């Protein structure tokens, strides 16, 4: 998609805008002999709030075959807890401290 | 004569006893030690305290070794290219000064 | 003797430079234990004899 | 009997993992899990490749 400034300044109130946002973390280093880029890459639209809220895991790739890439996200522990049914039969996460 | 011989008579004798004259491979065929501090190949240490003898230093053949290698091809294909720019006027060029 | 020179010469000028070939990372559970002692996480598909 | 419920097997949940891949990243090495460990762990590994 391609959002003109005019469209963000004239979209009707209550219409849902649909914006796209790069996660450019999975972007490989430039070739050492690739030509220099004379001009700049500029950007105008930014979120006001966190966007990646549904995100669970990020950048499932190695960095130097051990080190994690900066900004990669392992799943939260709760995704994997599978605790137990409670005395009444409610679901529960496993105990943290033993007691 | 049999100087190239490594193993001889790979068959049983009474399902345990070795045939007389059968030859197991020498231990060095299987050492795969390590690279030295400078990167030479070496057999593993014999006694715990002594350092390992370099494989080139002794006459034994050894069939496992640590070879360094690139993980993928060196020739990525991004060959270097340049912006040659000529002198503006040939008369003005400074041949002088070394 | 002529032949020895060619070994020497041919070895004097070996310019081969190894790149990793196809590899394999068996799970430890699929390897009989001695092989697991000998293997080091992964190996070239073309292990030769030893 | 009244059809008060809806018998089903291998239930589908309310939330599911969606995943976007960058398809130029693949490990040169190839894992070789046992067939049963692949029957178990497999849909996961295929999803989080």
């Amino acid at each position: 998609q391609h959002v003109d400034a005019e469209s963000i300044m004239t979209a009707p109130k209550g219409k849902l805008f649909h914006l796209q946002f790069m996660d450019g973390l999975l972007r490989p280093e430039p070739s050492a002999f690739d030509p220099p880029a004379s001009g700049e890459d500029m950007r105008l639209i930014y979120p006001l709030q966190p966007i990646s809220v549904a995100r669970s895991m990020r950048a499932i790739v190695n960095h130097n075959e051990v080190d994690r890439p900066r900004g990669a996200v392992a799943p939260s522990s709760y995704e994997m807890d599978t605790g137990t049914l409670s005395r009444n039969g409610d679901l529960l996460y496993s105990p943290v401290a033993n007691g | 004569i049999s100087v190239a011989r490594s193993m001889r008579a790979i068959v049983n004798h009474n399902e345990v006893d070795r045939p007389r004259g059968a030859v197991a491979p020498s231990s060095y065929e299987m050492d795969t030690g390590t690279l030295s501090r400078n990167g030479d190949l070496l057999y593993s240490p014999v006694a715990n305290g002594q350092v390992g003898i370099p494989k080139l230093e002794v006459d034994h053949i050894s069939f496992s070794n640590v070879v360094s290698m690139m993980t993928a091809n060196i020739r990525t294909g991004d060959d270097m290219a340049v912006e040659r720019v000529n002198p503006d006027d040939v008369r003005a060029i400074n041949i002088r000064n070394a | 003797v002529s032949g020895l020179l060619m070994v020497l010469f041919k070895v004097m000028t070996d310019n081969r430079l190894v790149i990793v070939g196809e590899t394999t990372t068996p799970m430890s559970n699929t390897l009989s234990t001695v092989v697991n002692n000998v293997l080091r996480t992964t190996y070239h598909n073309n292990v030769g004899v030893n | 009997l009244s059809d008060d419920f809806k018998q089903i097997s291998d239930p589908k949940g309310y939330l599911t993992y969606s995943v976007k891949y960058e398809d130029q990243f693949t490990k040169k090495d190839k894992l070789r899990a046992s067939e049963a460990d692949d029957r178990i762990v497999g849909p996961t590994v295929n999803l989080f490749k």
Binding site: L25, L26, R27, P28, E29, A59, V61, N62, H63, N64, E65, P69 | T71, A72, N73, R75, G77 | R16, I19, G21, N46, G48, V49 | Q24, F25, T26, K27, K28
Partner: peptide, 26 residues
């Protein structure tokens, strides 16, 4: 049924290095 000798020697499998376009890390 007559006995027979035979022989073998380990083959070369030295391919020239492959050109993968895929990359393995960031």
């Amino acid at each position: 049924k007559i006995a027979t000798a035979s022989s073998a020697r380990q083959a070369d499998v030295e391919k020239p290095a492959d050109v993968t376009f895929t990359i393995e890390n960031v």
